[PDB]
A paper describes a structure:
Glutaryl-CoA dehydrogenase (GCDH) is an acyl-CoA dehydro­genase (ACDH) which catalyzes an intermediate step in the metabolic breakdown of lysine and tryptophan. Unlike other flavoproteins within this family, GCDH (EC 1.3.99.7) performs α,β-dehydrogenation as well as decarboxylation of its sub­strate glutaryl-CoA to yield the product crotonyl-CoA. Transfer of electrons from the glutaryl-CoA precursor to the electron-transfer flavoprotein is mediated by the cofactor flavin adenine dinucleotide (FAD) in both prokaryotic and eukaryotic electron-transport chains. Like other ACDHs, GCDH from B. pseudomallei (BpGCDH) exists as a homotetramer with tetrahedral symmetry and possesses an overall fold similar to that of the human enzyme.
Here, we report the first structures of GCDH from B. pseudomallei (BpGCDH), including the first apo structure of any GCDH characterized in the absence of FAD. Although highly homologous in structure and sequence, the apo structure of GCDH from B. pseudomallei revealed a loss of secondary structure and increased regions of disorder when compared with the previously determined human GCDH ternary complex. In all four protomers of BpGCDH, electron density was too poor to model from Thr139 to Asp145. In a different region of the human complex, a short α-helical turn comprises part of the flavin-binding site and the adjacent protomer interface. This helical character is lost in two of the four protomers of the apo BpGCDH structure, further suggesting that FAD binding helps to maintain secondary structure at crucial protomer protein binding surfaces. Side-chain rotamers between the two enzymes also tend to be well conserved along this sequence, with the exception of Tyr373. In our apo BpGCDH structure this tyrosine is flipped nearly 180° from its position in the human complex, with a distance of approximately 9.2 Å between aromatic hydroxyls. Instead, the apo structure reveals Glu370 participating in a water-mediated contact to Arg97, with the catalytic glutamate carboxyl having moved 3.8 Å away from where it sits in the human enzyme. Thus, the tyrosine side chain of apo BpGCDH must rotate by 180° and displace a conserved water molecule in order to attain a conformation suitable for FAD binding.
Author numbering:
A (entry chain D): 3 to 141, 149 to 186, 188 to 352, 356 to 394
B (entry chain C): 3 to 140, 148 to 374, 378 to 393
C (entry chain A): 4 to 141, 146 to 353, 355 to 395
D (entry chain B): 4 to 143, 148 to 186, 191 to 350, 355 to 393
């Protein structure tokens, strides 16, 4: 008769290749060892210790799928997932910091940049010497690029850019007018005249990470700084799609923490002679947590394997990001409502983080509509 | 480059061996061909239909995991599930009939029986020549076996026994006191044997397409050669139930898919405000939830099926999958029912049949939440 | 003061003495005459047309219709109360009644000529004449039933589907488009049983509402004299006023079916044991019982207050959306809750299963759960989201 | 007739003229004085005991207490409308007020001596004296805080936890065992052996100052024990009265979330139109509207029943449980709609998460109600 691992019912551990398991082990060791002791004060006062980029770099956690050639650790998509799951187990803020370097900065430069851009930027982003941000979202994009001698002059604002006040490297999307008017990507650097990055304070969720603007006022960008190999929606969206995948895995790490913190709490606490764990209702909730996490992980894992094999279409990412974020939130709320205080209150932190996460990279509802269109051939917006 | 399959987002078809695809397609052809034309009649009138057993036996779908040595098709657990899903895709009542034969009759005989019992019973059960049934419901059981000359005499009633009013072979579990210990033992019986009655139950709300009844034991004589020698206690009926719940977890997903596909076609065909129903955001969200929940549920039963084939699967996992599958199928059936208008005459009101079937299935035994609550906490409620 | 678990807010004390007496008479009739019928009627899909006369005699047909025309001249609160008592037994019987009242008597009274009113209403009040309402076709703006002017009146061709009472109806109120002067508008026409070109075949093998006979209305150039056209309404206003009336009684009725499933569930857990303990003492069971009580209790406050506002003419049509959506949704959740609490498979308790399939149709008829959400959303925002 | 999206059942029209005045009085104060404070007060867990002064001035404290003792002599419906308007701004503010009214003034008025009543009620009423209520103990009816008879007459030892208002209280209503039964004792700021230190770093209710009560053989003069209550009836009476106020207040918080969510979807655009054009959005809006609309009928009728004398205690269980659960769901719906003023919702949300869980995580009101239906305890 087989052992039952309640904490891994389907033995995900045995579904992994050994280098994958050991990437997971390293990320785990790092987050629990270096981020967990930081998290309570950092979230409380809204502090980001940028040395974190430098830290994840040293052990090869920045841009996991980027080839060794360009300074990356040359890992697969399953490994990218496991890393994100381990970092978010501690805090979603720290997962975002990492999501931005990997998917929103390193990925566009690798996929759409020339050989010189890749050689100049990727090695230093891989180590965390250089910190990246990604400028898409604005306060139908308005930000413009006008051809000038030597390159391009950019004007417009981006808003809600994580990493931007501390960023070395900016991947900015703007419309460039041929007679056709299309979306292009540009690489900018800290120090470029016309480039501002004011910080943003007061966030309710993701408070462990720092966010800001990118303000452009005729910021000169040379010819060698336009991403040569992409035009239109493809650029920004390939980035978002990569990020959603890590977010799919990450939210599940958050969900596991809440689940474990709830589980221990009811083992520990008592009402009317018995530990809370004796309660029938309590056991249904714990069974719900375990079930949804268990299925979610098979979901993201399978997506990882398909992405690795090139058989994964983009709508699968809607399923998993929507599912992980939605279920993680449900689990955080269940866990929250199981607590009677006003320490094990890390749960309250995970909860407000997940409230934000479920709102970014596409709402729960817009992902539903993506699946609805793919099922019906009818757009509902 | 990779195409999306709304009907199989994760490409489960590609996660199978061509072997298991052919087993799946064979069961599909049978069920759509032979069972589907019957079902509305059989459900509405709670008809007694037995020719299904030969039909599935001929094509080697009865007792899939029983070796060829005893007339079985020697298949694995993954293939069992695929067959069960395909039968339930038509009706849970038919899947039920088939579940008794394979899991609750051929399985205990094969596992706990003597060689002679195995060659007497299994090959006739395998072809459907003999219809089996399973007497458990009435650890604290009241049905009793007494030591007598040349064997045992049995007394008691078994309630809600599917296939019983038409069975040729009865696997009855009764308590036997001997030497001081009062353990649980299993017994084989045959049709038309003195002291044995199998009267029917009519007027069921669900599972109507399947004949159910009682087993009535009035000091019924059983030879020594008919007591299952290799099991006493819990492990006897538990083994069978575990096997059945594996099949059920797979089967409920089939019924869930029927409701989903029916609801999807219906909202594409039906128009309101000059516009297909499928154009509505509210409709699309529902279709996204159905697709999500089935897709994850199918990865769940796939993994478990692979884990059983490698002896890596603890019994608690089965509780996860059976609970999830049945739960989610019912929600989906309710979602689909609530999406339809009109009342009973169209094909789409196959949803209503599936619905009441699943209401029975979901409450037949929250036994599984508790099993899992205890597996996590150690504490029983 | 003590607790009434069955009536926490003592709704019984919020009623007027006449309203209370009207309720007890509806209770006495439903329990005495309808309860003994319902199990076989539902199982065999039989409707005893004699029910309509029984209902007529005691003033349950067109409760709000004036005594001039045979109605008992009662207030809206009393109408609701009547619908709750009938639906306590079966939604199929409440259906029969709400059709006669809101979908037949109401439109003739409100829109008809003096001549039509006196010709039709008294016999619909006694139940001598059975009515049915022809709007739904195989939303009303996309209607294809067509009336065309001929010498002496109109010719009607089209098809109506899922029409309760139609196979046994003496009176048919049929909605059809008529191009006239400038505009193609919706008109209501009265038809009698026997009329040439008019057929009402029954529909058989329903999943829900099996206790009420339902059918079609098939018009094949059926002649309608000028005297049979509702003179005093055009367009959506016609069908809608009737539906608003029907939804009000449906919103009260559904709480009746909810109450039955609640009472049945509670008695069951009082009787059954599990692991040596009465099912009643389980915590989760008590949570479900508390949810049922709460939703019913609040749902009743809602429909009563709606009842009051209508009687004093302060109620807008949107408040009917709230209470129809709420009563039906909550009643369905409660029916599902009760069903999931029982083991077995088909007895007295599987009266719940009857109430359940009934409520599944009810939730789906006279505007879906979602359609009423969208009426409410539009009223809150000024932006229509229907299409 | 005209439809009122924001008051579909015309609750205005169900209230007496003086009841509508008291509501608006509380509304005016809340929006005028409390709303401009709340963001900073909440964010930095600062409380301004001036609120007691301002509420006492306009008679919002102990609203059901007779004019004879300095209260406004109002009815239960009025208390409810007051709770609702304060919580509309913040659950923390409502909490401080609800302690003053239901957990201090009510037991003194109900169980006290005429002299205790004359000393404390008037100063509590004006908010010159700030009160608090000592029942809940660190780990725990069967409490451990005990009174033993000394010479005239009592010595109390024990601890009480999560006590709102304590670090700023003038008056302390403590429940202790004495033989063996539960009794209430009045202590005042200054009594030797009595300490009320603050609890900092709360997730929710951050706008109400909270603390503990530590009694180290604190002496209570014999004149200070409540003479007219023994056992469970004492603390329960206070809790039942407070639950009633919370039942109204939770709806006020729910209303703000609904109104904030509504305006947000009206103001914000996506794909060329307002969010409010989305079907998924309108259904949420319709649910919020329905549950609030119904919840209000429920607490209004309960109010009228209290004023009549026709309400058992179990009804308060239905309404508190409903109001808190529904308010919390609505707050979460509202949170999940937002992409700033609007984030008043996140504050209402953390408040409602605390408020819903305050009486244990095992749903005591379901059981009270289940018991009441079956006759069989859980």
């Amino acid at each position: 008769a087989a052992t039952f691992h309640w904490d891994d019912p389907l033995l995900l551990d045995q579904q992994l290749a050994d280098d994958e398991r050991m990437v997971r082990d390293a990320a785990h060791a790092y987050a629990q060892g270096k981020l967990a002791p930081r998290v309570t004060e950092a979230f409380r006062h809204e502090t980001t210790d940028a040395a974190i980029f430098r830290e994840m770099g040293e052990i090869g956690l920045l841009g996991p799928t980027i080839p060794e050639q360009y300074g990356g650790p040359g890992l697969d998509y399953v490994s990218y997932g496991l890393i994100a799951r381990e970092v978010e187990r501690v805090d979603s803020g720290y997962r975002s910091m990492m999501s931005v370097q990997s998917s929103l900065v390193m990925v566009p430069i690798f996929e759409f940049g020339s050989d010189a851009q890749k050689e100049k930027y990727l090695p230093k982003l891989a180590t965390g010497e250089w910190i990246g941000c990604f400028g898409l979202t604005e306060p139908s994009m308005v930000t413009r690029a006008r051809k000038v001698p030597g390159g391009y002059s950019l004007s417009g604002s981006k808003m809600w850019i994580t990493n931007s006040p501390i960023a070395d490297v900016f991947v900015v999307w703007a419309k460039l007018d041929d007679g056709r008017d299309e979306i292009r990507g540009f690489i900018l650097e800290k120090g470029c005249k016309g480039l501002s990055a004011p910080a943003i304070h007061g966030k309710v969720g993701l408070r462990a990470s720092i966010t800001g603007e990118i303000v452009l006022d005729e910021a000169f960008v040379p010819e060698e700084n336009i991403l040569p190999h992409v035009k239109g929606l493809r650029g920004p969206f390939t980035c978002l799609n990569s990020a959603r995948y890590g977010i799919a895995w990450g939210a599940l790490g958050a969900a596991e923490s809440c689940w474990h913190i709830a589980r221990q709490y009811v083992l520990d606490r008592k009402q009317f002679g018995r530990p809370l764990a004796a309660n029938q209702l309590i056991q249904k909730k714990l069974a719900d947590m375990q079930t949804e996490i268990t299925l979610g992980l098979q979901g993201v894992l399978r997506l990882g394997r398909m992405k690795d094999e090139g058989t994964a279409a983009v709508e699968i990412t809607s399923i998993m990001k929507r599912n992980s974020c939605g279920k993680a939130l449900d689990i955080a709320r269940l866990a929250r409502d199981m607590l009677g205080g006003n320490d094990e209150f890390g749960v309250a932190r995970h909860l407000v983080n997940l409230e934000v996460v479920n709102t970014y990279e596409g709402t729960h509802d817009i992902h539903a509509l993506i699946l609805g269109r793919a099922q019906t051939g009818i757009q509902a917006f």
